[PDB]
Structure 1
Amino acid sequence: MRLLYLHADRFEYKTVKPALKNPPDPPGEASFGEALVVFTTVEDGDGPQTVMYAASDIASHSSRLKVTTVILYPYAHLSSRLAKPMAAHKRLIELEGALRTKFPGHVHRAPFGWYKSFSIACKGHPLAELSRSFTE
């Protein structure tokens, strides 16, 4: 699992066209205030332990930033070892569930399988932008 932690003053996205033949999440759109935006690439070989590591780190980083909103934003472009679409959608479902057990704020899981337009205003401070890898 490759992740990118963007501490944003603002985030919003809208799904456009389907990217997979059968996108497992309905289309949609959302906009946010301050939020840690976690760009998430599920990698071939992520399982439950990977998920719990990532959940723990996401919650601890958020606590550091004092953020109360976390967006889990599926992203196919952070690495060159992706899990297949089905497996990836499952791990993201589990990652959302797992993060709720470690983080008291708002957790928003963005839809998986769509091309999306997004806007972000990413903060300029030293820890606004960090990358993370998790494995098992």
Structure 2
Amino acid sequence: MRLLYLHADRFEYKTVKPALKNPPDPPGEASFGEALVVFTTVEDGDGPQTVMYAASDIASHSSRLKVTTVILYPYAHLSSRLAKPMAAHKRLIELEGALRTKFPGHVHRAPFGWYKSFSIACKGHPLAELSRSFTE
């Protein structure tokens, strides 16, 4: 699993066209104030142990940053060892579930299987942009 952590002042997205023949989530749009935005690429070896490590790390980082909102943003573009779409969706659902057991704020999982527009204002501090790899 490959993650990009962006500490944002604000974040918003809208689904536009479907990117899979049948997207497993309904279309939608949402906008947020200060949040940790976690661009999340699910990779072929990812299982429940991987999900648990990512969830702990996201919780830990969110705590460091004093953020109370996390956005789990499905993202196909951070790796060249992608999990298949079905498996990726399952892991992202597991990741959201796991994160809620570790982090007490708003957890928003954006819809999987869509092209999206988005806007982000990303902070400039030294810990505002980080990437993470998790495996088992």
Question: Into which bin does the TM-score normalised by the smaller protein fall?
Answer: over 0.9
The count of corresponding residues between Structure 1 and Structure 2 is: 136
1: distance between equivalents of 2:73 and 2:95?
A: 11
SS of equivalent to 1:3: strand
2: distance between equivalents of 1:110 and 1:82?
A: 18
2: distance between equivalents of 1:115 and 1:35?
A: 21
Q: Percent identity?
A: 100
Shift of 1:124: 0.3
Shift of 1:57: 0.1
2: distance between equivalents of 1:29 and 1:112?
A: 12
RMSD: 0.2
2: distance between equivalents of 1:103 and 1:133?
A: 20
- What's the CA shift string for 1:68-102, capped at 9, x where partnerless? 00000000000100000000000000000000000
**Structure 2 match to 1:3:** 3
1: distance between equivalents of 2:79 and 2:123?
A: 23
Shift of 1:30: 0.2
What TM-score comes out, normalization by structure 2 length? 1.00
Shift of 1:5: 0.2
SS of equivalent to 1:92: helix
Structure 1 portions without partners, runs of 5+: none
2: distance between equivalents of 1:48 and 1:84?
A: 16
Shift of 1:10: 0.2
Shift of 1:52: 0.2
- What's the CA shift string for 1:7-45, capped at 9, x where partnerless? 000000000000000000000000000000000000001
2:89 is equivalent to residue 89 of structure 1: yes
